[PDB]
Amino acid sequence: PWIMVFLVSMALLWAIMTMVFFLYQPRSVSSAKGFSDRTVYLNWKW
């Protein structure tokens, strides 16, 4: 049954591929230190 073995093995290898694809830890370490310098004071007239 080499044809069914080939099809089941490749379907399982693709299933393992899409299991690993969603195996990640989303690290929300987006620091907001840029806003400490984004604000600019109003320029005067000289």
Binding site: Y41, L42, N43, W44, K45, W46
Partner: protein
């Protein structure tokens, strides 16, 4: 007099509490250049030396010239100089008010 020349100024203490140094380094000029207009204000009074007409009456045989010069000095009064920068400063003030209103609105947002 010497009121609005010798014995008056603007409070610089609240001025230095906002300026972000390198952003407003012209304040270092503004505190200094206006100080030049204070330095010449150390000089230049209204009457720098009153004229002792009695001394010239005693030192001259004919005091009629002294009385004539005293009358001419009293008959001449210099008024305050003309100004044409007031409207320019008012226009700059109005533009500053509009920009401050816009900046306050952006700060509120």
């Amino acid at each position: 007099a010497s009121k609005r020349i010798a014995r008056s100024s603007i409070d610089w203490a609240k001025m230095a509490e906002s300026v972000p140094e390198s952003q407003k380094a012209m304040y270092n000029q503004f505190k200094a250049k206006s100080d030049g207009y204070i330095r010449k204000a150390l000089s230049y009074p209204e009457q720098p030396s009153p004229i002792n007409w009695e001394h010239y009456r005693k030192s001259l045989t004919n005091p009629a010239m002294v009385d004539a010069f005293k009358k001419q000095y009293e008959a001449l009064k210099v008024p305050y100089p003309e100004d044409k920068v007031s409207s320019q400063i008012d226009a700059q003030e109005a533009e500053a008010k509009k920009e401050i209103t816009k900046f306050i609105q952006e700060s509120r947002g």
